[PDB]
Each structure stands twice: as structure tokens, then as C-alpha cells.
Amino acid sequence: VSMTKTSVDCTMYICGDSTECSNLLLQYGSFCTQLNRALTGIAVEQDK
Amino acid sequence: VSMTKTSVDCTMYICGDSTECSNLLLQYGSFCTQLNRALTGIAVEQDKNTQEVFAQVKQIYKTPPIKDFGGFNFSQILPDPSKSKRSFIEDLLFNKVTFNGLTVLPPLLTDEMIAQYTSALLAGTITSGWTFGAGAALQIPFAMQMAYRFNGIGVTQNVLYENQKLIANQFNSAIGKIQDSLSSTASALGKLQDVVNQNAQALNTLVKQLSSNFGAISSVLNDILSRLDPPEAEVQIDRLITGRLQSLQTYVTQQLIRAAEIRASANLAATKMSECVLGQSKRVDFCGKGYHLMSFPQSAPHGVVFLHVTY
Amino acid sequence: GAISSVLNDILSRLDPPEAEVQIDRLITGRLQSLQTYVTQQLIRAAEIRASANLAATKMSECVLGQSKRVDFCGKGYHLMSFPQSAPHGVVFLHVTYVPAQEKNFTTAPAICHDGKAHFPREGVFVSNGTHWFVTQRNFYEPQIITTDNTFVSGNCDVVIGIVNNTVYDPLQPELDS
Amino acid sequence: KNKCVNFNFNGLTGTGVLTESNKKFLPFQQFGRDIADTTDAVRDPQTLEILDITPCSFGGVSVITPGTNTSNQVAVLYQDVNCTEVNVFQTRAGCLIGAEHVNNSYECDIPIGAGICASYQTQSIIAYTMSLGAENSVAYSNNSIAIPTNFTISVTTEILP
Amino acid sequence: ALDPLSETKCTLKSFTVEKGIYQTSNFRVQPTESIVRFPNITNLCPFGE
Amino acid sequence: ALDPLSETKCTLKSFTVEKGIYQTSNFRVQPTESIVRFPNITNLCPFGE
């Protein structure tokens, strides 16, 4: 029925505690945010 | 039932009319063509979902001119001949739902034609009942239809004929509450609002990714060609190609995943339209809470609404 | 984007420290191809999994038994299903009961014999313009309306659209005999 | 104006159909973008006038044709393209060249889009509104009923991969 | 490049084409002439002086 | 960065906030000290040699 609700932060996984890394990751744009939308979207779906 | 048919040109998106970009884009093989065949496959599938749900009968059934259905007022569900003939509820369902190579294809079956299929199935359940879904349409009085629908749930036919006026007031009042809830509660169509917004967010997010650099000196191809030489421009342009190419692979991947969700929901609505609407289903809680008598179909933008009459 | 699609050409043409740059492009390019192919197969796996559950549902429900679901087994009232194997699939032969010929008749919710309303127990009352009979909703079979083929309840004043007819009580001619 | 031409303004460049509109930018606003950060309108630097950036007509070129054993006559569809920028019938999906529009509605054989379909009939290709089946005014009343006198055992072929 | 019928044969990779609609190519209106626009050249330098 | 109410607006890109729960940011405990520990400095390397 339900899966393991996981919310992997796109920034911390790719750039773990790094501001220089984060500035490079902003150049990709929604490739970071869109993964958070889906992962947060899955967690809401498992509750449904 | 269906999604927004969006055929994104793989070449125009990655390469904004840049010959140097296209020459490098061809080096990636058929990733460009595969993205087009996937979205082209989706757009054909959204039409199949519309056909399996709405294009269920090969005849356009019409109601008689005299609106005498044994006390059941279907004026709020039948098409309005004065208004794109749609019912008063359908008018609420349509009103309560809100460049760079992204070709938004139209559907095969238009909204004015979707309402005609629903009116055909609606007229069939009213005039023919459960006989037009199995074979030739056999007219039955609606008071007689509901009697055997009561018998299908363990209720003897005498309950209807002895309380035919009761169900008429309950049914007509129940339809009235639906119009009040749809007109008052804007979140009643929240199911379809999430679908059109999800496709809109992915579509808008797809266009916003063109402004992203993906590690390149600039997101615009013309700036790279103007700033750097040809042998140097190919490196930075490649970063935008591989960056924008993976964006389409992401968008196509999400749309394919969402297509499976709408495909499953369309097959669910296809089972309801083919079982719950065309006839009477003994599946408990399949047509919603309560013993299912019949279900009247209603159209909506890229969706379908069922009015499950339950005992 | 590499100098050549063949790995042997890169290793032969370019030096070791320069070959890794061009070989990396073929790796990420061919890896992206596999990630694309596997992503599509996992998606098509969801499509074939749905049709497999439908086929399994349309096997165990339609072949192994009878289903009252409309349009679940072909077109019409389901009688039986004979499955037929196919390459990487299955084909069902949904045998259905399709009414073809029809005729218009006059009916009523009940009949009045002695003031009480007689409802149809299992079937529907019909009329050929001269006499009243009872038959099934899915087959025309004129049967004389008896006390066993009907159901007594209420009176004839409450029922809307009720008519008058004579009910054949089997005790009457048997008692008179 | 009103021509698909490449443009090079003060700060922004691109390709699209230059055309005026009724919009009004602010005195300092020189360019304009849509919700998705795509340039949708600009102000001409020389003349103080607003100019919308309509994209050049683009879309897929679909070919409507019957079977090879039927005939070699075909029709072309320019998706989302007006017939003035390609006897000829303008459809909601695009400009359909090579098909005669017929008022009589027939069954959808070759689904084009937006309720429009085509078929090879008496010979050439025709265009028509998608017919949703044969009209059947079911005779309904509070006393009539249809009971089936005969039936046919039909065997439906359901294919499921 | 003979006729639209042949485009379907090359797109579908089959001589025989079935009754239906098939996407063979894409239509793209090319730019007719590059249009360069810039504000009027005001505040001239004092090179003539 | 004003308040959690504003954090939802820039997250959802909507002025009107709807009823519900929304993830807006990521809590990250910042480091307190700048500890840099190294082995005992006994001898110096002979770069002069």
C-alpha cells in the first residue's frame, strides 16, 4: 500500500555543506528543485 | 481522462535556430528523435483514453421531446439546446477548471463532441437503461428501470412504486445540492486542477530551463558564438545541448510517468463508464458509498465526472 | 561529440591523457542511452503490467467464472470466454448474449385483480394490445400472469400508472374440480 | 512588421514574427517577457512603440493518405499553421491541403484532429466533421417497452498483451 | 522529395503505407532578413571640434 | 526570508497561500567553532638543506 517516504534534499546530496558547489548547482536551475517536487510529491501520494 | 497533448520539438528546444548547435546535436544520435516519438506516443494515447471512455457506443441516442421521466428532473444533466450543447452542471465543470518549439496539439475529440457522447450515454441510461450497453437499445420506462435496479441490490420493486414520489424529490434535491457544491466549493474540481497545473508546471519549468546555463558561460547560443570562436564555441554549446537534452528526457520521463497515472485513471473511468454508467454494478463501493442504482455521465475539461445515484 | 564513435580509434589516435576526455564523452553518451532505454522499459513495464493485471483479471473473472460486469467480456451480457494464446500475449473469445430482434410492447408497474397491487416477481408485464402477459427483461416469452409469477403488496391507489388485469389463481380451477 | 524575421535589438536578439499590439510598457521598460522568462514583447528602441514577439510559424508536417492499394492521392497538414503562410480547407489543427471539405458528416476513418477526419471517397480525399455515430431517437414513454424476441451469440475478440 | 506520399514511405521505412495520418517532417518559416534596431545616435563625441 | 508565511510564497510562487503544509527550506545547523587540530609541532622540516 505505502512505500518508505523519502525526501532527499537535492542540494545537500549533490552539494553537502558547500556554498561554492551550490553556486555551480544553481546554473542547472530546476534540475535540483524538480527532484524535490517529485520526492515530496511521492511522500504525499503514499499517504493517499 | 486525457492530458494536454504537447509535442515538443527536440531540435527547436535545444537549438534555437542555430546551425552550429544542430550540427553538434546530430552527434548525439537519436536522443532527439526518441524524445519526439515518446511525446508523439503520449499524444496518441491521450486520444485512446478519450475513445475508450467517451466513444463507448456507436449510436447518438437522443431523449424524447416531452420531458416526462416519472418525476425525475433531468434538466440539470441533459444538454441545454440553447447554449456547445452542455448541461447546467457541465457549465459549472468547465468554468470551475483553470513558443520555443512546444507544439500544443489539439485533441481528436473536441469538448462540444465529448458532451454529445455523454448525452448519448445519458439518454441511453434514461431511455434504454442497461440494454443499449449490451446490444440494441431497448426502451424501458425510467420508473420501470429503477425498479429492476432496486431488485439488483436486494430491494423489492414495490418499494419504488409505493414511494415513487419520494425518490423523485430526493433525486431532484440531490442534483440541486451538487450544483450548489460545485458553484460554491471551487476545490470540487481539485482532481483535474492538479492535472492541468502539473502539466502547466512541467511545461513552464521546461521553458524556464532554457534560461539555465548548465555550466556554460551563457544560456543563449548567440552569446556563445559572439563571445567565443567557432572551435571554442563548440565546447560551451555542448554543455547547453547535453543540459537541455537531459531536460527533455526529464520532462518526457515525467509526462510518461504522469501518462501512466492518467492511463490508469482513464482505465478506471473506462471501467466505471462501461460498467457503472452503462449498467448496474454489484461491486460494493465501486460507484461510491451506498448500494449503486445507476450513474449519469458528465463531461469536464480533459476529464469526466460521474453522478453515482446510490441507495 | 567525440572525435570518433569507435573506442579503438580514440586509443590509437589520441594519447592516454587526451583519450580520457574523448572516451568520457562516449561513456556519458552511451550511459545516457542505457539510462534512456532502461527508463523506457521500466515505463513500458508499467504499461504491460497494467495489461497483465487486466488480462489476469479478465482471465480469472471471465474464463474461470461468469461476470455480471457490463462490457467486461467483449460486447454484451457475458456468457463464457475461451482464451487463446498468442506471442507474448493472450486473446480472449468473449461469448456474449446480444439481443438482436425486438418488438415494442405496452407495460405497467402492476395489475389490479381485487384492489391489491400485483407486482412482477421475476420479469416484466407486457401487453400485445389485447391480452397481458409476463416475460423476462432479456427475452420475450409470453406467460400467463399467475399468483406465483407476481408479488402482492400495498393497494392499487398508491401505485402510479397501474392498470387492471385478471390474475390466474391456480387454486380456483383446482378447487372447483 | 508582420513578417518572420530575425531581430537584433539593443540588448536582446532572436528570431520571430515582429508585430505591433495594444500593450503599453512603462517609460523605462525596453523589453518584455512572459511567465516563463521567454521574450514575448519588446519596445522598438528608435520609435517609442510596443511590439509583440510572435514566434515564426512552426509545427509538424503530417501526411493524410489512404492505403497504398487504394490510391496514391494524398493530403498534407501543416500543424498550427494558417493557410496564408504555407480547394484548401483551414482546420483548427492546421491548414489541410489536398482535401475537399464536405458538409455531410461521416465516420472518422483518418483522425486528423479537433473533430476533423478524412477518408478516400467519391475519387479524392474529403474532409468532414467527425460523426459520433448514427442518430437513434429511442422511443421513450411511461407505457412502452422493448423486449427482445431473438438474440445472436456474438464472439468478441479482445486482445490483451 | 517527390511527393508527400513518398515522404511517408521514407519516414515509416515501408513501401506500403496504411490508411491513416503520419508525421513526416516539420515546417519552419526561416527569417527573411536580419533586422537591427538601436536607439538614435545622440550625444555625439567632440571629435569634430 | 521574512517569516514562514513569506517562505511559502516564494516557494510556491503564489501570493495567495492555500491551506496545507509545504516544504520551503532545509534546516542546517551552522558550525559553531573553527576547530583545526593537528599533531604535535616538534620539529621543523629542513627546507634550508
Swiss-Prot record, chain B:
Effect on the protein of changing N36K: In strain: Omicron/BA.1, Omicron/BA.2, Omicron/BA.2.12.1, Omicron/BA.2.75, Omicron/BA.4, Omicron/BA.5, Omicron/BQ.1.1, Omicron/XBB.1.5, Omicron/EG.5.1
Record note on what altering N213K does: In strain: Omicron/BA.1, Omicron/BA.2, Omicron/BA.2.12.1, Omicron/BA.2.75, Omicron/BA.4, Omicron/BA.5, Omicron/BQ.1.1, Omicron/XBB.1.5, Omicron/EG.5.1
Coiled-coil ranges (or none): 193-237
Renumbered residue ranges of the record's region Heptad repeat 1: 164-214
Residues bearing glycans: N73
Outcome after substituting D68Y: In strain: 19B/501Y, Omicron/BA.1, Omicron/BA.2, Omicron/BA.2.12.1, Omicron/BA.2.75, Omicron/BA.4, Omicron/BA.5, Omicron/BQ.1.1, Omicron/XBB.1.5, Omicron/EG.5.1
Disulfide bonds: C10-C32, C15-C21, C276-C287
Site location (Cleavage): R86, S87
Function comment: Precursor of the fusion protein processed in the biosynthesis of the S protein and the formation of virus particle. Mediates fusion of the virion and cellular membranes by functioning as a class I viral fusion protein. Contains two viral fusion peptides that are unmasked after cleavage. The S2/S2' cleavage occurs during virus entry at the cell membrane by host TMPRSS2 or during endocytosis by host CSTL.
Record-given protein name: Spike protein S2
Swiss-Prot record, chains E, F:
Start and end residues of each stretch annotated as Disordered: 28-44
Glycan-carrying positions: T32, S34, N40
Effect listed in the UniProt record for changing N40Q: Reduced viral infectivity
Function noted in UniProt: Attaches the virion to the cell membrane by interacting with host receptor, initiating the infection. The major receptor is host ACE2. When S2/S2' has been cleaved, binding to the receptor triggers direct fusion at the cell membrane. When S2/S2' has not been cleaved, binding to the receptor results in internalization of the virus by endocytosis using host TFRC and GRM2 and leading to fusion of the virion membrane with the host endosomal membrane. Alternatively, may use NRP1/NRP2 and integrin as entry receptors.
Quaternary context: Binds to host ACE2. RBD also interacts with the N-linked glycan on 'Asn-90' of ACE2. Cleavage of S generates a polybasic C-terminal sequence on S1 that binds to host Neuropilin-1 (NRP1) and Neuropilin-2 (NRP2) receptors. Interacts with host integrin alpha-5/beta-1 (ITGA5:ITGB1) and with ACE2 in complex with integrin alpha-5/beta-1 (ITGA5:ITGB1). May interact via cytoplasmic c-terminus with M protein. May interact (via N-terminus) with host bilirubin and biliverdin, thereby preventing antibody binding to the SARS-CoV-2 spike NTD via an allosteric mechanism.
Protein name: Spike protein S1
Source organism per UniProt: Severe acute respiratory syndrome coronavirus 2
